[PDB]
Write a protein that binds this DNA or RNA. Structure first.
Ligand code: MG
Ligand code: MG
Ligand code: MG
Ligand code: MG
Ligand code: MG
Ligand code: MG
Ligand code: MG
Ligand code: MG
Ligand code: MG
Ligand code: MG
Ligand code: MG
Ligand code: MG
Ligand code: MG
Ligand code: MG
Ligand code: MG
Ligand code: MG
Ligand code: MG
Ligand code: MG
Ligand code: MG
Ligand code: MG
Ligand code: MG
Ligand code: MG
Ligand code: MG
Ligand code: MG
Ligand code: MG
Ligand code: MG
Ligand code: MG
Ligand code: MG
Ligand code: MG
Ligand code: MG
Ligand code: MG
Ligand code: MG
Ligand code: MG
Ligand code: MG
Ligand code: MG
Ligand code: MG
Ligand code: MG
Ligand code: MG
Ligand code: MG
Lengths: 138, 125
RNA sequence: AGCUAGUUGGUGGGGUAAUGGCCCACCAAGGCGACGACGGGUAGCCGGUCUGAGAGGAUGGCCGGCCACAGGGGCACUGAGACACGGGCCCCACUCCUACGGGAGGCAGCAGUUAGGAAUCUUCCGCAAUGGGCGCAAGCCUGACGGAGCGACGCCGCUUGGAGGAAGAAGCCCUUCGGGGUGUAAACUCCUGAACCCGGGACGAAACCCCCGACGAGGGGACUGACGGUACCGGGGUAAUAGCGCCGGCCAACUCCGUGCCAGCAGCCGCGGUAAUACGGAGGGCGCGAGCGUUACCCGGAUUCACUGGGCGUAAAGGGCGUGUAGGCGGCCUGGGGCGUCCCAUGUGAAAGACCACGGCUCAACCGUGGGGGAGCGUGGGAUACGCUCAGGCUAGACGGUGGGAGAGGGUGGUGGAAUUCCCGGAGUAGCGGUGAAAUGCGCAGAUACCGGGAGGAACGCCGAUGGCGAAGGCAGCCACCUGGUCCACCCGUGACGCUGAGGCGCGAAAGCGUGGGGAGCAAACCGGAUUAGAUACCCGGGUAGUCCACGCCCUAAACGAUGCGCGCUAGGUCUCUGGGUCUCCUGGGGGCCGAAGCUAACGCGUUAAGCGCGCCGCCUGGGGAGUACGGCCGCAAGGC
RNA sequence: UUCCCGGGCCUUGUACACACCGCCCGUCACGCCAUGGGAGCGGGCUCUACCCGAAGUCGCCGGGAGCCUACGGGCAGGCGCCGAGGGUAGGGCCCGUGACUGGGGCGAAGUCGUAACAAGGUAGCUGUACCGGAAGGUGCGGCUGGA
């Protein structure tokens, strides 16, 4: 019955990226739409659009991959190596401004929901807020 | 388990078991002997090891191994119990301290004389 | 797993500095509890301390804060304050003096004795300092305190010399006897020089006091040290304590002799039974050094209670299955609030401790100063993405309508034939049964085989399938009735009604039990006959409960897919069952095989997950003792949880 | 080429690997350790009812009986409630102990048999019921952890 729409979306993307697909569909939410915007600016995907499927609004999330490499298993590298929901609906995780993770020692991104909108780990500490730690992506 | 179950049911603790009941965890506990005898070891080894049943001041009567080569222990000897077991001897989980009380240490033991209670040879040495 | 008599609440009093069932009358029947009441066991609590990468775990000795005690127990008095450690009264235990009737005493204050124990100190000095009490002051009291004494109990600092020195003494150890080692080590040469003798010898001390100014501000003067002749400084000055653990692997350090599963070692693996780096010694070496080891306990390793950070198909572990209460969790759009949540300042977070500096004791331990943030909670202000709530609204979730579809789904009642056994009649004879082979047994008293008639019970061949239905156990001749689940189509209705589910409740194979029927075949037990060393078995002949029915119990299993349910996502090839269609083919549900990606220790799984995610429940934490013991609940009992 | 012995390759199964001259099971016997039940015995803690009940607060009285400094009063004293505690009585929990008895565990070489591991010589396991010196056997039903 879709307990967690956002972990559903992140798992949608996690399964789409393992079989190297053009895009996959996820039902639309104004909050999901913000999270996909943040994934888009950082270069984890190529963008999105409010498509319509059977009178029901989904979101085509166009995937981005690495270059075709050589040797056995020429399947490319992922742009998203690891994406997982941190704060669960049964396990709420709330962080202040001084307690924010360093995702892959700066190389990754933490996405988290604050009173100043949906932000990243760098943007949250720039603005100085902290909030519900949505997910870590790299 | 789930976080809700861990809230409801919690996590248990190890709660160690005392391998030496020397009563208050005393490092040592004195008792008079009652029997000074020789016992045979377990399956893999073979000897006649020297043990003693000791009527502790804990109110316990326990066996105790008599280390070193040779002893001076009798039925009415007073002796200090140490702790630590002999694996080939079942029922012996505690050691006698030598050089403490009526029990004396090994004579002519000249290497590891901090153990087995032997005094320094003072022979320009 | 239930507790509750002042018990819960009220009214009016008593009482207190003061609220309050704190106590008392009268009234009402409440109060608490799985969010763990009540009860049992244990424990003084904290700042802090130990450990840890941290999250955590452990702990509360010194010191500071709080509490509670003062031989056991109770009570008041005085008083601002006590239920009063060195004040009072009473009861008991104990001790001491008694002229025997009635007195005295309370070291959990500083020392100290005794008992216990593995174990824990001086019946020291002084009010010079600080602090407390009384006092106008002088001063007096101060076992608070300042110090000293004892114990390597701990930490820190220092010494037992330094530099020279033989192709390398003696001793002793090993030797492939030539040599190698201890070893610059020592002997020996100088130089410095702990300890000890000698003189000086304090910081901690300046006030209280006195004079002036008025016993104010201010200036000046006087007395006073326990520690202690000690620290420290100067002069002189003698080479001057070293030990303990280990040397198989973890783990750094190897040979020789003795020994022979003996004596012995031991933390685990394990060594010792003739050539032992594992025992005993020696030589040598390694690790430390006024210590070194051992024991006992705490954290660590232990990510073996996993919040970080574990799992459950086969290793420990999915509840037998459903239903469902509490609880946990929950779709898309729009606003109100601003509880969760975030931010800002502010209040608090005592000191001490820890960290960062800078200093003080010749260094350090120790100590002083300054500084920095913690975390938690109060108040005020703000933010509204997510969670919550209130409200409006949506349809993908869910349920419902209409039209249908398959089925061993369930209960009741009825019925058909095949077969078995028995009874009757006919006909018919000398053997039939049975085994590996036999025997028991049945048979001339007319068997087995054949026919005809009759009774009775149980189970449904072919269909029938590696097939179907159900939540599970499970369900199979046919018929009728009553009845649940379920799948498809059409996108018509309500519209978030959702998922899971501790207890509860219901179903629950076989076997077993109770009461009453029925009993053809089969068949525990039991009896025979063989097989066998012996057979309480396997093989054969009989054969009772039971298997069948009704009603009531019983709750077990390899109740197995050894895989809980719900939803979302991630190649397909193929077989089969049942629906719909523009039925060549597509699509939906269901049952199978193979296999993308991915997962697994492998075996294997693979949209009928063991993949990738989320929600909820159950369970696991070495083998045995053990599903045993005790307690509890249930059962007629067996026994069950 | 069935059968007896030995050998060769493949494949299947194994709980064997000193390798089937293997391993393994349960009574029985001796010894020892911990332990359950047990006529009872001995304590500890606790609860309930009643009896006696000191000191002492409080409440009366303070009168045929005292004392007082201001007496329609105070003190002494008497009575009462509560009361530490002692006594009696019956329960609850816990601990030690008990003739005897049940099972468990250990003890290098004890007696009896062959249960399981290979189709273990009757496939095994299992719930249950009955039976047997012992493992175990058989009945009914289920499982693949077998053919
Ligand atoms: Mg206590
Ligand atoms: Mg750790
Ligand atoms: Mg103390
Ligand atoms: Mg005193
Ligand atoms: Mg003593
Ligand atoms: Mg003073
Ligand atoms: Mg001075
Ligand atoms: Mg080594
Ligand atoms: Mg040794
Ligand atoms: Mg030192
Ligand atoms: Mg841990
Ligand atoms: Mg976890
Ligand atoms: Mg199951
Ligand atoms: Mg349900
Ligand atoms: Mg919601
Ligand atoms: Mg707020
Ligand atoms: Mg502080
Ligand atoms: Mg609404
Ligand atoms: Mg409609
Ligand atoms: Mg049943
Ligand atoms: Mg039955
Ligand atoms: Mg019956
Ligand atoms: Mg009867
Ligand atoms: Mg028969
Ligand atoms: Mg035989
Ligand atoms: Mg038979
Ligand atoms: Mg059950
Ligand atoms: Mg199970
Ligand atoms: Mg299908
Ligand atoms: Mg059982
Ligand atoms: Mg039981
Ligand atoms: Mg060949
Ligand atoms: Mg073979
Ligand atoms: Mg007993
Ligand atoms: Mg067999
Ligand atoms: Mg059986
Ligand atoms: Mg039988
Ligand atoms: Mg069977
Ligand atoms: Mg079954």
């Amino acid at each position: 019955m879709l307990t967690d729409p956002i972990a559903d979306m992140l798992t949608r993307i996690r399964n789409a990226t393992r079989v190297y697909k053009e895009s996959t569909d996820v039902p639309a939410s104004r909050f999901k739409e913000e999270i996909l915007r943040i994934l888009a600016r950082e270069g984890f995907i190529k963008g999105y659009e409010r498509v319509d499927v059977d009178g029901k609004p989904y979101l085509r999330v166009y995937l981005k991959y690495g270059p075709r490499r050589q040797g056995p298993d020429p399947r490319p590298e992922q742009v998203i190596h690891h994406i997982r929901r941190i704060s669960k609906p049964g396990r709420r995780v709330y962080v202040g401004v001084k307690e924010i993770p360093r995702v892959r020692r700066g190389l990754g991104i933490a996405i988290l929901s604050t009173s100043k909108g949906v932000l990243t780990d760098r943007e949250a500490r720039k603005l100085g807020v902290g909030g519900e730690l949505i997910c870590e992506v790299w | 388990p789930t976080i809700n179950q861990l809230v409801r049911k919690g996590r248990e603790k190890v709660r160690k078991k005392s391998k030496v009941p020397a009563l208050k965890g005393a490092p040592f506990r004195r008792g008079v002997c009652t029997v000074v005898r020789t016992v045979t070891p377990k399956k893999p080894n073979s000897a006649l090891r020297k043990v003693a049943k000791v009527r502790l001041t804990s109110g316990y009567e326990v066996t105790a191994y008599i280390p070193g080569e040779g002893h001076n222990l009798q039925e009415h000897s007073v002796v200090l119990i140490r702790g630590g077991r002999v694996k080939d001897l079942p029922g012996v989980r505690y050691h006698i301290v030598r050089g403490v009380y009526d029990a004396a240490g090994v004579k002519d033991r000249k290497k590891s004389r901090s153990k087995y209670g032997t005094k320094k040879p003072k022979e320009a040495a």
